[PDB]
Amino acid sequence: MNRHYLITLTPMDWFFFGGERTLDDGKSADYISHSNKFPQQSALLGMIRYQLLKQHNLLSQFPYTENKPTEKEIMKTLIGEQSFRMTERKAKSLGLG
RNA sequence: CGCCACUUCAUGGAAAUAAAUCACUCACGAAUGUCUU
């Protein structure tokens, strides 16, 4: 009913985890891009959602579509209807699928 | 005064010695220091 897994990630090559991308904003990029030693938990959650959408073959491919609202419902109940945001940081549930 | 020829056919020494053996210049120059979604 509620199965728990342990997921181990083995780096097969050199990895790069993004930073602030800038000490300011506007249009500037950073000439030196530094790698965080750890990814954000948002990255882990998005990886889980993407892999779940890969197992159940419901992926967003090539320009743009509307994804067959029944498929929209199944994707909502699989991965949730929304990404990780800190607006719902006090919500009692993860809000995902 | 007459008559008359033989012998010998390079050895020893020096057989390369000093000077210069790379020198000067250039030893990186210019563009890009983030860009497009």
Side-chain angles (χ1 to χ4, degrees):
Chain A
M1 77 321 305
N2 258 10
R3 214 166 340 130
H4 321 309
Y5 303 97
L6 164 71
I7 306 163
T8 64
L9 321 153
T10 326
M12 276 200 305
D13 203 31
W14 295 81
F15 50 90
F16 165 81
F17 297 123
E20 202 28 56
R21 171 133 198 290
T22 12
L23 62 172
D24 73 357
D25 214 279
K27 75 277 143 293
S28 147
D30 253 355
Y31 171 77
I32 317 285
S33 317
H34 284 286
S35 192
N36 286 351
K37 269 156 217 205
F38 269 48
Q40 266 143 5
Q41 299 301 124
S42 320
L44 296 185
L45 283 140
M47 188 237 78
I48 298 285
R49 307 220 306 171
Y50 185 91
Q51 284 298 313
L52 279 174
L53 281 206
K54 253 203 59 196
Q55 297 182 249
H56 308 86
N57 177 26
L58 307 122
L59 248 201
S60 176
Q61 285 120 315
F62 90 106
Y64 186 97
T65 165
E66 103 302 356
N67 213 342
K68 273 43 63 184
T70 157
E71 271 71 22
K72 258 211 304 306
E73 298 334 329
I74 194 67
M75 209 182 66
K76 280 175 85 288
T77 172
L78 204 61
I79 71 171
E81 73 313 354
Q82 213 219 54
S83 35
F84 181 113
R85 347 180 80 84
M86 299 232 318
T87 319
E88 302 141 21
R89 60 186 104 102
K90 326 191 57 53
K92 316 318 315 323
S93 296
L94 203 38
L96 287 191

